[PDB]
Design a protein around this ligand. Sequence first.
Ligand SMILES: Nc1ncc(-c2nc(N3CCOCC3)nc3c2CCN3c2cccnc2)cn1
Length: 839
Amino acid sequence: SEESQAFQRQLTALIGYDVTDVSNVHDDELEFTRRGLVTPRMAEVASRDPKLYAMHPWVTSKPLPEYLWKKIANNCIFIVIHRSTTSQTIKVSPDDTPGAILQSFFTKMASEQDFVLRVCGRDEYLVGETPIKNFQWVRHCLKNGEEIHVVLDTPPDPALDEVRKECDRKFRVKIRGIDIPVLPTDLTVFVEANIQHGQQVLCQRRTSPKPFTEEVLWNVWLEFSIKIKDLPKGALLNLQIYCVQLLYYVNLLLIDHRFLLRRGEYVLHMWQISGFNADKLTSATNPDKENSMSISILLDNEMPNQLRKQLEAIIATDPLNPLTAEDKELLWHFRYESLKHPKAYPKLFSSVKWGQQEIVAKTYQLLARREVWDQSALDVGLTMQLLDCNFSDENVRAIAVQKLESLEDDDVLHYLLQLVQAVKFEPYHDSALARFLLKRGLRNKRIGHFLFWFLRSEIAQSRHYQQRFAVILEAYLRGCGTAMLHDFTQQVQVIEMLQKVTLDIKSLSADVSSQVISQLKQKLENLQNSQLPESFRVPYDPGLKAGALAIEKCKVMASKKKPLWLEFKCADPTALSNETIGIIFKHGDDLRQDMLILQILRIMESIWETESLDLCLLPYGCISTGDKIGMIEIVKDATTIAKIQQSTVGNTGAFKDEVLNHWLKEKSPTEEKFQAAVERFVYSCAGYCVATFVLGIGDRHNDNIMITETGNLFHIDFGHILGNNKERVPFVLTPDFLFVMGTSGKKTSPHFQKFQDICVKAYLALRHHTNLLIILFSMMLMTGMPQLTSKEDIEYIRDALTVGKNEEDAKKYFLDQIEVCRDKGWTVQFNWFLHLVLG
Ligand SMILES: Nc1ncc(-c2nc(N3CCOCC3)nc3c2CCN3c2cccnc2)cn1
């Protein structure tokens, strides 16, 4: 209690927000949730295996892709085992268990003391009843032509991740008045009061427009058409101040976490409006009590074939195809036929009249008979779709969370970022989903690691959602165990430390000075001495452990935002290299945007592994740490396409076609790896060409396009590029690119033919998962892109994915897009150089 009061203070520093600061609640939902989450946490903490939780094998059930079989020769793999320099290579079968590999090293190559296989230089273990092929580190070693190096050492003590013991009356609302302490011509204003479910306004009332003054009282009752008994759980009283223009909004759940109608008096601090967006939907009141508009209020008391075809044609349409009233009555009337087709649950449930108790009832008996949904194989795109903003009913959303239960960790990891983000569409703080995220975090340290940083990312920069997430993070941190609490402490300490330096250095300059490099050197020299902890997990690569600062190599970069280039010596002495761990720290870019996109890129890579494609993207690590502040992984041996041109040509001039290829060959040691490098370029250029085209970020300056010194090409800096007579492109396929593939003007090559057929295989792979990408893209815009003004923004994705077009004309459509890049040439890049130098 004296001890335990200190613990909460630790949690609070980890969390980044005090989940006990009860200034900003008009009720107790948070505490109720903090109290609700104790059971599922203790359940999973009681349920998990300590050994397998402690070493956390990262594995997968997915079948080893074709492109990695055709890199295995004579069905064996070469595991290089180490010890104290005493190393010995071993031919192992892909289907060998890892304990059954110790049988070879130990019981072959001349009661027992059980040990286990760890990856060299990493917190990564190949344990548990799984075949060597099915471990992701291996697949990664294969895919990148590397050698499986492991140390034969002891298990981690699984007692280091234990944790501390512990009527028919029409609904009416009385609008008393509104209150802004300072109000910056003249003005009139009214209060608009919408009754909402899932972005559908069930009912609406306005007040009369009074003059705009620091205080504006009405005392009017607003009676609504809807009956109290007709109000659905999850309905929001949404209140909004207009002047015609929206100025402020706030929301309040009409039915609360206890199934009680909301009685009594309320004073609600509201959110201003910049310039939909998931912030509009929060149940959270603005904490800033001295500068925020307030509002005060009171509450007291078998079918025709013609139709089947029409039903089928409705179920077939994309998720952004709006439903006419005609479409909805059809779905609803034939709801049981609709119940047989999973693809159609979204539209079917978007056709419920949620503001009518008896229909909602019908919807629930219609959910009692959901045998087909339960059995069907998980579609994530569909599952995601019932957890977006259009679904506010909890039972509807519960079936989506059900489908996620059957996801394996590897998959949960791909969709983690956007599931966390999906909590923002939950009506209540305690939900199936938030508990889901909690169980999977506690079941697996890898999921856990990234949860922490995903939650903490929002907590640090969303007033609208910090509290809710704070209770989810809090709950999780009381389950991970002492070790992780200790790791999270170390990483937090470090990034706070390095965040200081980044901002300091930014203030001290308006190019770079010798005085600043000095200042960096000094400030960073001091940090090293005492302040820094010994080592720490790299947040974007939790298996990797950074050690000391390679101060020699650290510098500050030549942008207008002056980021910090920092390198660290690795802390695992069994690391088979002296290569540093490179981390960029930047203030000024909204790297939440970079996160959502990199993780979509990772999702596309996995859409391609299903169709035996591997387009060699390098979606590097990015963790957004607070507001316009974060870290970026450094992909070693890489520079920009621009700087490569600046070597030969220089500061300005005619951007030449010869340079890229020369730089490639000039870096390759032999003409064996160069032709791999070129192969890599071909594949990597296509991947990014397609990925970026579909995401709408294909038109980039070559300053923001990069290439490794083994031919891997990759884009960077994804912030605020989705903005809104000028020359454009679908993607950057410049003459320098083409020159490396072997073409000019309208010529052709085999490498170009490989390119053209890689794209289309890629581009139609994505279109196989049209619906999935449409949802992910839609969610990305709402929860992470400020400037999400229109839904028209979302539609871009459907056009690019050419929905409602056959596989083949879609083939030709994409070839027309590449042809444009050929016909546009160097001009757009030149316009970018012009734009990025001339105002
Ligand atoms: N938002 C944002 N994101 C990334 C960068 C950036 N990143 C990186 N990385 C190094 C290689 O590993 C991948 C990351 N390099 C960058 C930038 C901005 C400029 N830049 C760079 C680095 C070296 C030479 N020329 C340009 C800059 N801004």
